[PDB]
Symmetry: D2
C-alpha cells in the first residue's frame, strides 16, 4: 500500500528523480519530456513500453510530436508507491541518452 505525503520514504525516493514534480497532496508525480523530433520521442516511449509491461506498471502519458507528458501513480493503491519511482527512474535514464 500507499506511500504517505512528505513521508520519509517518499522524499528519500524522490531524491533520485529530482526533475519530477509532486502533485497536489503527494498523490502522484508529473514530468514533461522534450525530444528533438517525434522519432526520438518514440524511441523513448518504446523503451518505456517494454519495461512497463514487464513490471506490470503503466504510465499515464500524453504524446504530441516531440513532447511526452507523464503523470505516474499506483492506481490500485490510489497514490504513490515504490513502483512509481522505479518507473520514473527508468524513464529518466532512457531519456538521458537523447542529451
Amino acid at each position: 500500500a500507499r506511500l504517505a505525503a512528505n513521508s520519509a520514504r517518499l522524499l528519500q525516493l524522490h531524491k533520485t528523480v529530482p526533475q519530477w514534480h509532486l502533485t497536489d497532496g503527494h498523490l502522484s508525480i508529473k514530468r514533461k519530456f522534450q525530444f528533438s523530433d517525434f522519432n526520438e520521442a518514440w524511441g523513448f516511449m518504446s523503451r518505456v513500453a517494454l519495461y512497463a509491461d514487464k513490471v506490470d506498471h503503466h504510465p499515464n502519458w500524453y504524446n504530441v510530436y516531440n513532447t511526452v507528458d507523464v503523470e505516474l501513480s499506483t492506481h490500485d493503491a490510489a497514490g504513490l508507491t515504490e513502483k512509481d519511482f522505479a518507473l520514473a527512474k527508468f524513464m529518466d535514464d532512457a531519456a538521458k541518452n537523447f542529451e
Copy 2:
C-alpha cells in the same frame, strides 16, 4: 494545406468515412477513444499508428493509460481540421479493427 470549414460539405463527406469519431466544438478537431484488452494490444496498435504518422508527417495527440488510447486529431499549422486528420483517423480505425 487549406484549413477545412465547420459543417462544410467536404468535411461532412470525409467524416462519413470515419463515423466512430466525435467532432469538437466546432469543428476544430476530431476525438475517439480506443479500448483494447490489455496494454500489449494497445501498444501493438500505437506502434503501427507511429509508423504511419512519421511517414505522412502528421501526428496524433493521444493519451494512453494501460489498454485505452484516447486520440484527438487536427492539423496544427492549419489550426483546425484538414484532409490529413481524416487520412489518419481512417488508418487508425483499420489498425484497430484487427483487434476485433
Copy 3:
C-alpha cells in the same frame, strides 16, 4: 528449466498447439516464417512480440526483411527446446492472426 527431448511425448503434445511451425534437426528448435502485407504490419506484429518477450524474459531469433519476419526459437541456457519456446510460438501465432 529442463531441456525437452526429441520426439518426446511432452514435446509432440505442445507442438500439436502450434502446428504451423517446423522442428529442426533434431528437435533442437522450431522455425516459422511470417508474411504480412507490408512492413507496417510486420512491425505492429514484432512490436507486440517484443512486449511479451521482455515480459517472460525469453527472446526470439528473428530476421526481418520488409514484410516477412523469420523466426527460430529455443531456450539458449537449455541448448534445445523447452516450455517457454512453445509459450512464445503460441503468442506469436495469435498476434499474427489479427492480420488475417
Copy 4:
C-alpha cells in the same frame, strides 16, 4: 541505379559510416550492433523502424537478445545506393545514444 565497387562516390559515402564492413564485391554493407540488453536493442530498432518506413528503405536485420545484425543494400537496384548510406548513418546515430 546502382553505385559501383570502389567507386569514388561510394568510398566517399563509406567514409561517413566507417564502422560498417563492405561485402564481397561491394554489393552491400554489414554491421553488428551490441547493446546492453534487449530493452536497449529494441529502443534502437524502434527508431530505425520509424525512419525506414518513412524513407521507404528497409534493413535486413537479425536480432537476438541484445545483438542486432544488419546487412544493407538496395534490392531494386541489386547493390549499394545512396539510400543504404543514409540508413547506415541513421542507425549509427541512433546507436550512439547507448554509449
